[PDB]
Amino acid sequence: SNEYDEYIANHTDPVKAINWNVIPDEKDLEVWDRLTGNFWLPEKIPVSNDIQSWNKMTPQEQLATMRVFTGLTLLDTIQGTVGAISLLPDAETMHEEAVYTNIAFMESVHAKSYSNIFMTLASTPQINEAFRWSEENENLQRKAKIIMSYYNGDDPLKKKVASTLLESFLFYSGFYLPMYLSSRAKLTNTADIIRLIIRDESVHGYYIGYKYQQGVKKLSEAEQEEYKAYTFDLMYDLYENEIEYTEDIYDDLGWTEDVKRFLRYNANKALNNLGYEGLFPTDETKVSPAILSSLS
Amino acid sequence: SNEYDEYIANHTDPVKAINWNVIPDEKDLEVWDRLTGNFWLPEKIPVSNDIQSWNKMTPQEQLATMRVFTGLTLLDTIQGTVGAISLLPDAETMHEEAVYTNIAFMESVHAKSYSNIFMTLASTPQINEAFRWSEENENLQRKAKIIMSYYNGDDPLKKKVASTLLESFLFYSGFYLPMYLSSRAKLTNTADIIRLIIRDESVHGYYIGYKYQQGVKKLSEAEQEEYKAYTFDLMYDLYENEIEYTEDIYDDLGWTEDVKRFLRYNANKALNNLGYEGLFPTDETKVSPAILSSLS
Ligand SMILES: [Mn+2]
Ligand SMILES: [Mn+2]
Numbered sequence A, B: 001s002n003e004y005d006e007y008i009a010n011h012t013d014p015v016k017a018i019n020w021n022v023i024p025d026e027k028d029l030e031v032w033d034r035l036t037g038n039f040w041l042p043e044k045i046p047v048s049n050d051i052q053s054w055n056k057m058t059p060q061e062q063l064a065t066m067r068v069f070t071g072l073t074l075l076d077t078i079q080g081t082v083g084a085i086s087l088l089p090d091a092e093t094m095h096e097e098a099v100y101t102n103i104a105f106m107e108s109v110h111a112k113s114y115s116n117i118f119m120t121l122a123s124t125p126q127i128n129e130a131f132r133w134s135e136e137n138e139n140l141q142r143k144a145k146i147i148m149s150y151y152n153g154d155d156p157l158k159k160k161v162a163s164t165l166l167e168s169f170l171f172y173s174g175f176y177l178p179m180y181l182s183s184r185a186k187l188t189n190t191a192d193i194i195r196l197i198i199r200d201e202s203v204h205g206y207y208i209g210y211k212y213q214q215g216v217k218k219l220s221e222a223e224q225e226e227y228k229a230y231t232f233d234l235m236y237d238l239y240e241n242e243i244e245y246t247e248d249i250y251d252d253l254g255w256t257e258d259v260k261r262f263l264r265y266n267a268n269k270a271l272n273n274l275g276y277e278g279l280f281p282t283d284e285t286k287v288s289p290a291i292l293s294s295l296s
């Protein structure tokens, strides 16, 4: 009766209902239609049909798979419960806020999809060892905490930069494995789930980056230069850390050199989403056409 | 020094990836399965088939519909972009956090559903006048700001109470109209959308209410009695404000008395969702049979 009187006295402007009949930025509606039109749940893909394929894989291949998927789960958990949500208060339109709520939910769907895969293919000990490894891996924890330091900060623009780098770059050291296996006719149903996830992340990265550019272009030329400097500096740090993460996961298998090229290819895409030129020359980003297609 | 060095040192515990193979509270999984299994979009309902019955409605009915729907849109806008989200930080389990991301998203689908209805049935001036009315109505703004004062507060249990009361009580002064109209062959397709929303809100209130109960039972004797007193004080404050809002919406139509019974009926259900006895004797909650039948 009184507890809320102060709040009411300090918020005299009307609270407004979202009006979808009036859209000041057409992009918000285009992305909302795209994302909602692409709704899916992991229960829709028959992962159990990969059991034979999975049992045929070597212990090294299985271990690499558990670790990359656990790393991916951690990134989705962060993005869904902390990332997308941190973007809400800095939205330019109410329709953009609505889009972020869809992004948050689909991230939770993504994270859950990995457990569906594990629960269908792996043993309890394997699952347990995997989650423990993710808590102890220094590089995985470092990339997670670097991104979270920005979501927990007070610069709306840095939150969008961190979010775009996460969505367009950090997931890729992990996405290489299922896409490559898929090109060898292995774990094909699991790859279908991975493609649905990529189809979402691609749009998330594109959209959040678009919003970053709109905000940064409102600043002076000098300020804009500082944000670009910050973006590239953050990319150098994430790349350095991802290289070590990659070596540790893929050295046994011997896939490391190709995964590093894949990292550089996507790092360029991530920068492009933020409106900047790529960092690595094209000749250093070669990706197998069998991966690029099964990726799409 | 890296801008994130300190944050990494102020957060030693590892960041954990959600694991759906280990569920500390089965209710979280049960609710995630129900909510995700109930996914829907307003585009799936053929609202255009209601065009004829809409034009048949009286000026008083159309005006009441526009206003009630805008009020509902306002409440969904708040629940989706501020409410569900404010619950994340105090979740007991990570699976509970996932459920809130789905609730946030579906609240945005609910808000958009009303705009889909408007755009299909109403004129632009009617839509514009409705949103302006919602901005100027003191009772609607009052209930919205009271709820938001708790979401912006620092007491996690109060946020849950405010949320359950909004989901199990504040929506009903509005849900009454489409249920009344559909029993009289008016806006029957629009009523199918309303039922899908109610199907979601009934689970939301049941779930957030359940989490409130778990949390409050972990407190001392004095604190449990204080939260109970707080809950009844707020419920009465909200009911009082709702009476005024209801009279101003339905007096011209003359449906007010039956609507007030519906309010008392749902207020008791909301308190039951929070583990408490109802506030109104059963005999004061006898809504006409036609209304409850329409909900079925
Ligand atoms: Mn994701
Ligand atoms: Mn994403």
Ligand SMILES: [Mn+2]
Residues within 6 Å of the ligand: B076, B079, B106, B107, B110, B111, B197, B201
């Ligand atoms: Mn709703």
Ligand SMILES: [Mn+2]
Residues within 6 Å of the ligand: B079, B107, B167, B200, B201, B204, B205
């Ligand atoms: Mn709800």
